[PDB]
Design an enzyme around this catalytic site. Structure first.
Site, short mmCIF file in Angstrom:
data_model
loop_
_atom_site.label_atom_id
_atom_site.label_comp_id
_atom_site.label_asym_id
_atom_site.label_seq_id
_atom_site.Cartn_x
_atom_site.Cartn_y
_atom_site.Cartn_z
N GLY A 47 -2.92 -10.40 4.37
CA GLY A 47 -2.26 -10.87 3.26
C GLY A 47 -0.91 -10.50 2.85
CB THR A 48 0.92 -7.23 2.20
OG1 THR A 48 0.13 -6.79 1.38
CG2 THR A 48 2.31 -6.77 2.55
CG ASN A 75 -2.16 -6.63 18.33
OD1 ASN A 75 -1.55 -5.85 18.25
ND2 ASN A 75 -2.18 -7.58 17.20
CD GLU A 81 27.46 -16.48 22.66
OE1 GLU A 81 27.87 -15.37 22.13
OE2 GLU A 81 27.51 -16.50 23.67
CD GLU A 133 -1.51 -2.04 2.67
OE1 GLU A 133 -0.36 -1.97 3.15
OE2 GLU A 133 -2.45 -2.84 3.04
CB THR A 150 -8.67 -5.76 12.81
OG1 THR A 150 -7.51 -6.06 12.43
CG2 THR A 150 -8.59 -4.98 14.18
CG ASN A 160 3.76 0.06 17.03
OD1 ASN A 160 2.99 -0.92 17.46
ND2 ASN A 160 3.54 0.62 15.82
N1 LIG Z 1 1.13 -4.05 17.26
C1 LIG Z 1 0.51 -3.72 16.08
N2 LIG Z 1 -0.46 -4.54 15.24
C2 LIG Z 1 -0.89 -3.80 14.05
C3 LIG Z 1 -0.76 -2.40 13.67
N3 LIG Z 1 -1.36 -2.48 12.53
C4 LIG Z 1 -1.98 -3.58 12.24
N4 LIG Z 1 -1.81 -4.46 13.10
C5 LIG Z 1 -2.24 -5.85 13.23
O1 LIG Z 1 -1.71 -6.38 11.76
C6 LIG Z 1 -2.77 -7.46 11.14
C7 LIG Z 1 -3.10 -6.77 9.76
O2 LIG Z 1 -1.78 -6.75 9.13
P1 LIG Z 1 -1.76 -5.76 7.85
O3 LIG Z 1 0.05 -5.47 7.69
O4 LIG Z 1 -2.53 -4.52 8.28
O5 LIG Z 1 -2.04 -6.35 6.58
P2 LIG Z 1 -1.29 -6.91 5.33
O6 LIG Z 1 -0.12 -7.71 5.89
O7 LIG Z 1 -0.67 -5.48 4.98
O8 LIG Z 1 -2.13 -7.38 4.14
P3 LIG Z 1 -2.92 -6.36 3.23
O9 LIG Z 1 -3.87 -5.49 4.14
O10 LIG Z 1 -3.68 -7.21 2.24
O11 LIG Z 1 -2.12 -5.61 2.45
C8 LIG Z 1 -4.10 -7.03 12.19
O12 LIG Z 1 -4.31 -7.99 13.12
C9 LIG Z 1 -3.47 -5.74 12.99
O13 LIG Z 1 -4.20 -5.85 14.29
C10 LIG Z 1 0.06 -1.65 14.72
O14 LIG Z 1 0.56 -0.72 14.50
N5 LIG Z 1 0.93 -2.42 15.81
MG LIG Z 2 -2.19 -4.91 4.92
#
Ligand SMILES: Nc1nc2c(ncn2[C@@H]2O[C@H](COP(=O)(O)OP(=O)(O)OP(=O)(O)O)[C@@H](O)[C@H]2O)c(=O)[nH]1
Ligand SMILES: [Mg+2]
Ligand SMILES: Nc1nc2c(ncn2[C@@H]2O[C@H](COP(=O)(O)OP(=O)(O)OP(=O)(O)O)[C@@H](O)[C@H]2O)c(=O)[nH]1
Ligand SMILES: Nc1nc2c(ncn2[C@@H]2O[C@H](COP(=O)(O)OP(=O)(O)O)[C@@H](O)[C@H]2O)c(=O)[nH]1
Ligand SMILES: Nc1nc2c(ncn2[C@@H]2O[C@H](COP(=O)(O)OP(=O)(O)O)[C@@H](O)[C@H]2O)c(=O)[nH]1
Ligand SMILES: [Mg+2]
Lengths: 48, 428, 135, 428, 431, 428
Positions: free
Chosen positions: E136-137, E198, E246, E63, E171, E220
């Protein structure tokens, strides 16, 4: 009139005696004791 | 924490609910605008038992006003403290109730119920830890008795753990506002026995005497009686809202009171009550209070406890006072007048106290007592019922709504087993 | 895991001197075969050819007498020694249970728009459908 | 190094916790803001890396209405905020709710606090349990908490300063029930249990201190004087130093008999100190005076199985042995045959401390007596009568059996009293 | 000589990389504009001809909406713009899209950038992979990247910090599929995996920091603290230095069991710090406390197999030893029988750093405990039961079959997960 | 990137597009002269999802307005924002469709499609990475329905990979604007089941209630309903245009919602919506949003969720809010109302969030739900269709356009199959 003529004392006593203890909080279910914890499930066969 | 939610069912319920919220709003010092303009931080401490924050620091009540005949919901909307309710919490019906328990409980009730339950859950989730409901009925009319108990028999299945009160105004033996009044009573009592944990009984008659004897009032208006009812309803939750050297939540007050799940018909009395003449002769001491409350005159229900036998009792005091004096006083009562108390209950009083009195006083008190003289009430209504029911007088009104005749016998016998429970437990 | 006796330094290694008054776990020291059977005895020698009982990936290879459902500590047998502290996504008197949500139904269904309020009717006539929606 | 852990349960436990912890902060010059302008405070505190002294106590309760006052009172900088534990709602004067419904999801939350509160101690003497037998939180959570301790510590010494239902003065109707259930639950789990009634301390406030407006904050100030006089040897020098381990050994003949009496002397107003001399012989005489007992039990109806004395101030050992010899010459006092001994003694060179605004008087001699009399079978029996009195109709039971209890736990807990009653006679 | 490479895939990958890099720049005195006013930054950075310290990380995503926030923010002079890798279209929470359709166009440039980034390295320690399983990503593209990295390097060590799909707070609705798929794909290729959830970190923020509304940035901050503690011994002095090899050797007992929990202590508010003392014994007890676990697993439903601890600040080895001995003597801690040993401890003289406008409190002692327990069988059982409940009906399967997969990939993954939970059962069973 | 092209077919389509492009234009601060005049730069970052830069800094939308009877296009050319459209993206036909699905799909449609498609391609290649299509309809008429579906079935082949949205306004029996609606409904639905990826179904009924009960409007004109529809269409593409801590593009919202390739009929609702009288009693918090959005009164379709069981749901919040408060609200729902959610999907809600609220508010939310009550929309239509087609009334108006009769059975069977798909997964 339809008066009951039952001894409410004995009735309440018996009701208190023979009653369910109530509601207690159950322990958080464990997934380590899931019946399929070890093996492949069934429906996967018919899916294949 | 300990959130309540307050129902107001019927003309009475919508007219004494006005006074109740004009007492609390003053107690927590919030203007009719809704905004808080009090003095201490003790107001804002436990405000959440009765209100909800809104933008700009304004508190609205968690009340629910249900009533047919919208001709009353213009009065509350025009009263001084009317602009504080949410406009949503106004469930009315353009149709009248006709002083008929049937249509209030069978036809016109049945479509408003869900429209009220949609509301009660919108403020049964607003609570952090719900304490319980409380209602203000009037067992004469059709709105308070028909939709009232019908609302209860719904609340009971969605929240059985919680605790619902009942400030039911009962019919009067000598004063008869209406003619059908006995029917609307019994058919409503048959609902309270199974779906109410506590139920105080109030009659306009003892309300008239206390207004004439103690208060010496010249013209007791209805807006004056409800200053008494609204005085005791606020007197229950003083422990919920304010600190106290012996606090008592609402739940622990019920278990210490009803020995068996059916004998939940109580009897109240407020102190002190004095004319503007005797404010010159009176002393503000604890023995003054406990003498006036144990009297057979403060009993806001027109039953004489000297005919029965107190099962248990209570006392909710307010005002910085000595916690021993309030214990030795209540101790003396059981010992001097030791006949009006049962034998199989060794200590049959409970005594609480709060550091915060009412706004305009320095010391007050409040009484609740579960007597057995309360069966005199249920005897009176059960003579007039079986009198005119024997000839089916005014019966075609009830059976036109789909009701039948067994619905009367059940409701009648269910008063007979009840009037004997209070008797067999009263071994003189 | 076991605790092997550190002989000269075995004092000052009781639970007490380590500020632990909680009924010490002694089986970690008693599974061993020390001389006196206690913390201060020396253990015993071996021949040391050390067979295998297991293939590469764990999974005890032969019919080795093994205890089933170990490494799990089931709820039905967890003495009050073992106990868990509940965490947030769970109701408990300490943390606040914030507000919830429910669906509130459309209203009283009708042939015009559904309304919450009940109104009078001019033509009663039991079992008939007449209204005045327009007012 | 000589460290203890103080636990407070229920409203009474917290209402005394304010008293004692106001005393120690004063007894060691600790400002209410934690710091002060070794081996002395280390009994009750934990000097952090910079300045502040945190108390090693834990206030446990279910009503928020008391623990929040501490969070707003002057003693709010003191407590580690996680030690003060408070729930949403309370047990509501019901043993079940404190034992089966609510107590079960907060004990482990308290244990984690107690766990981390026992590791920072380098030498632990034992736990101090302040209880309120007769309520829901005190009697329910308390008993449930002790069993979780007995499996976690087992041999450690747990004392119980359990206030007890008074014979006449009583602010409850169900308190005979949750008292019986409390004992049978704590009987096998507490190491030694002191008793004390609110009425017995009321008369002390009437005769001696001559305060006619007594409140609970006038009683809790009398209990802190006991323990400050009991744990002086833990933190103050003085001949015949005596700790807690040596306290239960020579005081509890059988594993059952650990219900004891208490006393204190002198107890005088500010002015009669200017009318007295308070010789050590006069003190211990008034210490054995039944009128100076903190329980409404009569020792002159029974015999003494042991005694324990803690002197304080300007006392030298020859007079303790001189005057005790006299008491053993008197005949109003009896001793069961199989203990010709019976007087553990203690001295401290630190006289008791006076509190600004208190009601005691600055003195230089004092005695805190603790005895195990067999006359404690009388206060025990009444509880077995009132329980048996109400249990015959099984009144109020539909509340206990509504919250996770059955009929077993009633007869179970009732027989043990019978078994303990005969135990108080088998020793004769 | 002590150099590592960091990879932030998916959205949460870069969401936590932002925190990690705001931590590192502040910790080493690096201004946001690259340069500062040796051997201390060389672990994470590279010096150009004059003063500029460019980080050796890679931000990979599909994205543009987040890489462009990064490009426009204050941290825009840091990165070589060729490191910030973005795509025109996203994976749309679809393992098939992330693995077969979209990620296979940019793997080529991601790999050649990783090549150019590892060229300048003299001694490479390992690859940190911050991933978020469930999207997915993240899932598919990390699986593809890890397979390519394993075939390229092989001898190098891959740590993967994987934000794991959570029990209840979620989510998404399809994530029980891509979680199983990502596990079955990466299991053979990652060298060690650190799980974290989370919900668990929400509970931690609730109970300790007294914060009630954490907007994905407090989590984070906590993860940044954890990695800083974990990689201290690479760039800071102190007794008992510990590096990546190690770390993984004495912690991964079998080729399958390489997923492990995590904890941190102390974690408090700026007032409970000022009103507590935080000795090393309290710190280690809080670390081994279950309610401090960064994942939603209860260790009392299992038995430990090894633990790793990294103390920071004013810590002494005798105190570390005494506290470990006390933990051993304790009764509520279990250990699988075949490890009489079980603790790899390390010390660092550098206390944990605090950020301006942060929420933690300045402390002088801290512990990051990392244990490999046999209780993650429960989370694997949860995930497998959810995958089962859904795939019993072929729900959502048309998306995965249209985006370039077939059915057999679901059966392979489910049988692999069944075998994995049977492993976690057996290898813990005792004779 | 992720450009989007937007179709407006029919009078309704040409009429809600006037509000949509007025809502969005204000949101990106562009005058009706097309020049940008906002404040922040977040209006320029993703403007290319809807507009095209022109000479002089004009931003012209990617809109396409197709309709017969050009009498409507002089209205959009007359409105305030009517000058922004490219006049060549104005496909009108001199004659009309006479509320007949056939001629809008067979005779007259087939004469504009050759031209309309040259319009849609002129702005499908103006995009670097096209995200997908979106249309607005009115399933009752002939222009909107007929040419609407005929245009769709041409897009489905030139661009099968991309995604097509549909904001169809389903007809309703309560507002019977015309008579031949049921014929024009099913014949269009039979085109939506195969040639559409998602289809939000909106009804004039629930569009009127929100104005009468929630918004309490006096005279709700279509110019006010379009202000409701345009809200959700702007509430969808927030994550496409604005940043957010948890973004959600257009495609991942589909996969997370539609399990089986047929059930692409959804249900919407926007929050918050208050009267001008209740802005005084309302708090701007997330729990307020999460209650109104789940309330079955807000669902812009007249299908009651309390009868079905939610398969999946969604929520697109806006504004700098806390993500924990939204992650647990959507969690607390399923735990309480466990029956209204299917069981073979454990956690069936997707949650988005954006840091950019609308131009006037600080917090806002948007809801999409896939329930099994959506069959009720199809039950009513499939009833009126089978009532008249059984007699073959009004049919010679469809056959006269060359249509056959078998298209009237396929169009109904394909529905009654779709109506059963939504019941298998409703286990009551
Ligand atoms: N600890 C933490 N978890 C996050 C955060 N943002 C998203 N997540 C979790 O990551 C998961 C979604 O991962 P994403 O990276 O948004 O999805 P993606 O891998 O990019 O796949 P696409 O949306 O299809 O592009 C969800 O369960 C979120 O709760 C963050 O800022 N901090
Ligand atoms: Mg994503
Ligand atoms: N010495 C002393 N006794 C008190 C005090 N306050 C209350 N008590 C007595 O303690 C008993 C009940 O006190 P509570 O603590 O409220 O009982 P509980 O355990 O909290 O049970 P619940 O009220 O249902 O929560 C009564 O007998 C009181 O007389 C006090 O301040 N000092
Ligand atoms: N204390 C008090 N009692 C009232 C008041 N108004 C009515 N009541 C009684 O209410 C009884 C009838 O019930 P009402 O509320 O008036 O009509 P309903 O709505 O059908 O129940 C009558 O016996 C009235 O006396 C009031 O304002 N104050
Ligand atoms: N929400 C909304 N619905 C409209 C509006 N105008 C017409 N409709 C509906 O559109 C339906 C008829 O379709 P219409 O567009 O007028 O004729 P068509 O060109 O053949 O599609 C009727 O149900 C109208 O009520 C509007 O402005 N807003
Ligand atoms: Mg109490």
């Amino acid at each position: 009139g339809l008066t009951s003529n039952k001894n409410f004392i004995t009735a309440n006593a018996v009701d208190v005696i023979l009653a369910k203890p109530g509601k207690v909080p159950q322990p958080e279910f464990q997934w380590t004791q899931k019946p399929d914890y070890g093996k492949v499930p069934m429906y996967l066969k018919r899916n294949k | 924490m300990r959130e309540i939610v307050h129902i107001q069912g019927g003309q009475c319920g919508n007219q004494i609910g006005a006074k109740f919220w004009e007492v609390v709003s003053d107690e927590h010092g919030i203007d009719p605008t809704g905004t808080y303009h009090g003095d201490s931080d003790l107001q804002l401490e436990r405000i959440n038992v009765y209100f909800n924050e809104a933008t700009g620091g304004r508190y609205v009540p968690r009340a629910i006003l249900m009533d047919l005949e919208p001709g009353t919901m213009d009065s509350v909307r025009s009263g001084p403290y009317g602009q504080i309710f949410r406009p949503d919490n106004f469930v009315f019906g353009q149709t009248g109730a006709g002083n008929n328990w049937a249509k209030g409980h069978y036809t016109e009730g049945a479509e408003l119920i869900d429209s009220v339950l949609d509301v009660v859950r919108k403020e049964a989730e607003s609570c952090d830890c719900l304490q319980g409901f409380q209602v203000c009925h009037s067992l004469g009319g059709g709105t308070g008795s028909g939709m009232g108990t019908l609302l209860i028999s719904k609340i009971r299945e969605e929240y059985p753990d919680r605790m619902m009160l009942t400030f039911s105004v009962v019919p009067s033996p000598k004063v008869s506002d209406t003619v059908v009044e006995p029917y609307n009573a019994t058919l409503s009592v048959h609902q309270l026995v199974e779906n109410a944990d506590e139920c105080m009984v109030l009659d306009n008659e003892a309300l008239y005497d206390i207004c004439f004897r103690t208060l010496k009032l010249t013209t007791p208006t209805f807006g004056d009686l409800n200053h008494l009812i609204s005085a005791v309803m606020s007197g229950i939750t003083c422990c919920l809202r304010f600190p106290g050297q012996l606090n008592a939540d609402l739940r622990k007050l019920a278990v210490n009171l009803i020995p068996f799940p059916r004998l939940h018909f109580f009897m109240v009395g407020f102190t002190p009550l004095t004319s503007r003449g005797s404010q010159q002769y009176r002393a503000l001491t604890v023995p003054e209070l406990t003498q006036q409350m144990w009297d057979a005159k403060n009993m806001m229900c027109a039953a004489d406890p000297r005919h029965g036998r107190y099962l248990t009792a209570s006392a909710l005091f307010r005002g910085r006072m000595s916690t021993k004096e309030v214990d030795e006083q209540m101790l003396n009562v059981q010992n001097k007048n030791s006949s009006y108390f049962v034998e199989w209950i060794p200590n049959n009083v409970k005594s609480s106290v709060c550091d915060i009195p009412p706004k305009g006083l320095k010391m007050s008190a409040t009484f609740i007592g579960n007597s057995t003289a309360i069966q005199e009430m249920f005897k009176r209504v059960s003579e007039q019922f079986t009198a005119m029911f024997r000839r089916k007088a005014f019966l075609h009104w009830y059976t036109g709504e789909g009701m039948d005749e067994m619905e009367f016998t059940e409701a009648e016998s269910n008063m007979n087993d009840l009037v004997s429970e209070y008797q067999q437990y009263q071994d003189a | 895991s076991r605790s092997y006796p550190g002989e000269q330094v075995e004092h000052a290694f009781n639970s007490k001197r380590l500020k632990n008054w909680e009924v010490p776990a002694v089986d970690k020291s008693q599974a061993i075969s020390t001389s006196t059977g206690t913390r201060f005895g020396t253990l015993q020698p071996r021949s040391g050819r050390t067979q295998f009982i297991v293939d590469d990936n764990g999974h005890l290879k032969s019919g080795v007498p093994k205890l089933e459902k170990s490494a799990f500590n089931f709820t039905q047998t967890t003495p009050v020694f073992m106990d868990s502290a509940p965490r947030w996504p769970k109701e408990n008197p300490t943390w606040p249970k914030n507000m919830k949500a429910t669906m509130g139904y459309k209203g009283i269904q009708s042939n015009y728009l559904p309304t919450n309020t009940v109104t009078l009717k001019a033509v009663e006539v039991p079992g008939t459908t007449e209204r005045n929606f327009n007012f | 190094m000589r460290e203890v852990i103080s636990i407070h349960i229920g409203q009474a436990g917290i209402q005394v916790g304010n008293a004692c912890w106001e005393l120690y902060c004063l007894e060691h010059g600790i400002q209410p803001d934690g710091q002060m302008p070794d081996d002395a405070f280390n009994t009750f505190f934990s000097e952090t890396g910079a300045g502040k002294h945190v108390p090693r106590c834990i206030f446990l309760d279910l009503e928020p209405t008391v623990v929040d006052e501490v969070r707003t009172g002057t003693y709010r900088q003191l407590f580690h905020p996680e030690q003060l534990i408070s729930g949403k709602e309370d047990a509501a004067n019901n043993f079940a709710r404190g034992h089966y419904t609510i107590g079960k999801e907060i004990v482990d939350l308290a244990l984690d606090r107690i766990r981390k509160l026992a590791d920072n101690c380098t030498g632990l003497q034992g736990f101090l349990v302040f209880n309120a037998v007769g309520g829901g939180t005190g009697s329910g959570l308390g008993s449930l908490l002790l069993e979780r301790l007995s499996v976690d510590y087992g041999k450690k010494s747990k004392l119980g300063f359990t206030v007890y239902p008074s014979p006449q003065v009583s602010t409850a109707v169900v308190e005979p029930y949750n008292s019986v259930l409390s004992t049978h639950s704590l009987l096998e789990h507490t190491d030694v249990a002191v008793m004390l009634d609110n009425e017995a301390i009321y008369d002390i406030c009437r005769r001696s201190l001559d305060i006619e407006r007594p409140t609970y904050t006038n009683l809790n100030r009398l209990i802190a004087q006991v323990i400050s006089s009991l744990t002086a040897s833990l933190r103050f020098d003085g001949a015949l130093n005596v700790d807690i381990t040596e306290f239960q050994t020579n005081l509890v003949p059988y594993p059952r008999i650990h219900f004891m009496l208490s006393s204190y002397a002198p107890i005088i107003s500010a002015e009669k100190a200017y009318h007295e001399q308070l010789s050590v012989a006069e003190i211990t005489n008034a210490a054995f005076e039944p009128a100076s007992m903190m329980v409404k039990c009569d020792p002159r109806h029974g015999k003494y199985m042991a005694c324990c004395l803690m002197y304080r101030g300007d006392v030298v050992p020859k007079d303790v042995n001189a005057s005790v010899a006299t008491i053993k010459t008197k005949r109003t006092i009896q001793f069961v045959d199989w203990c010709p001994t019976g007087f553990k003694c203690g001295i401290n060179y630190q006289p008791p401390t006076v509190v600004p605004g208190g009601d005691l008087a600055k003195v230089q001699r004092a005695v805190c007596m603790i005895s195990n009399s067999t006359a404690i079978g009388e206060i025990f029996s009444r509880l077995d009568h009132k329980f048996d009195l109400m249990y015959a109709k099984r009144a109020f039971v539909h509340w206990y059996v509504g919250e996770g209890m059955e009929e077993g736990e009633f007869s179970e807990a009732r027989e043990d009293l019978a078994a303990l009653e005969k135990d108080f006679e088998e020793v004769g």
